[PDB]
Design a protein around this motif. Structure first.
Motif, PDB file in Angstrom:
ATOM      1  N   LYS A 260     -70.757  58.761 -42.009  1.00  0.00           N
ATOM      2  CA  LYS A 260     -70.020  57.504 -41.901  1.00  0.00           C
ATOM      3  C   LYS A 260     -70.968  56.316 -41.780  1.00  0.00           C
ATOM      4  O   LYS A 260     -70.707  55.248 -42.346  1.00  0.00           O
ATOM      5  CB  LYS A 260     -69.058  57.547 -40.713  1.00  0.00           C
TER       6      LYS A 260
ATOM      7  N   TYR B 202     -73.105  54.639 -45.177  1.00  0.00           N
ATOM      8  CA  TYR B 202     -72.105  54.210 -46.145  1.00  0.00           C
ATOM      9  C   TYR B 202     -72.462  52.864 -46.760  1.00  0.00           C
ATOM     10  O   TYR B 202     -71.647  52.301 -47.502  1.00  0.00           O
ATOM     11  CB  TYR B 202     -70.724  54.145 -45.482  1.00  0.00           C
TER      12      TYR B 202
ATOM     13  N   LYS C 142     -72.449  49.997 -45.501  1.00  0.00           N
ATOM     14  CA  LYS C 142     -71.364  49.084 -45.159  1.00  0.00           C
ATOM     15  C   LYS C 142     -71.868  47.651 -45.020  1.00  0.00           C
ATOM     16  O   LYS C 142     -73.042  47.419 -44.736  1.00  0.00           O
ATOM     17  CB  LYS C 142     -70.676  49.533 -43.865  1.00  0.00           C
TER      18      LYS C 142
ATOM     19  N   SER D 237     -68.356  47.261 -48.573  1.00  0.00           N
ATOM     20  CA  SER D 237     -69.556  46.911 -49.323  1.00  0.00           C
ATOM     21  C   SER D 237     -69.317  45.688 -50.201  1.00  0.00           C
ATOM     22  O   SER D 237     -69.812  45.611 -51.325  1.00  0.00           O
ATOM     23  CB  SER D 237     -70.018  48.092 -50.180  1.00  0.00           C
ATOM     24  N   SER D 238     -68.550  44.730 -49.680  1.00  0.00           N
ATOM     25  CA  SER D 238     -68.241  43.512 -50.419  1.00  0.00           C
ATOM     26  C   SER D 238     -69.360  42.481 -50.334  1.00  0.00           C
ATOM     27  O   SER D 238     -69.667  41.819 -51.332  1.00  0.00           O
ATOM     28  CB  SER D 238     -66.934  42.904 -49.904  1.00  0.00           C
TER      29      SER D 238
END
Length: 73
Positions: free
Chosen positions: A48, A51, A53, A54-55
């Motif tokens: 997790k 990842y 972390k 995906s804008s």
């Protein structure tokens, strides 16, 4: 009599694994999964976390490449 009598005292001379080191030796012994049942949860949390972390990443990459493409800076 010791805690166990099987081979030397316990867990194939557990003193060597225990009291030689815990800062790095214990963590190296906990190399991967299938040591305890908590390794599944640890692997789940690891996958997790990894990842990306995906804008915002897409936005920054697109803006940077567009800026570099539009003109010689």
């Amino acid at each position: 009599c010791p805690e166990e009598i099987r081979d030397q005292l316990l867990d194939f001379h557990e003193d060597l694994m225990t009291h030689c080191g815990i800062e790095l030796d214990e963590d190296g012994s906990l190399d991967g999964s299938n040591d305890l049942t908590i390794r599944g949860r640890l692997l789940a949390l690891v996958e997790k976390v990894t990842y990306l972390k995906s804008s915002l990443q897409q936005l920054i990459s697109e803006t940077m490449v567009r800026w570099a493409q539009e003109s010689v800076i």
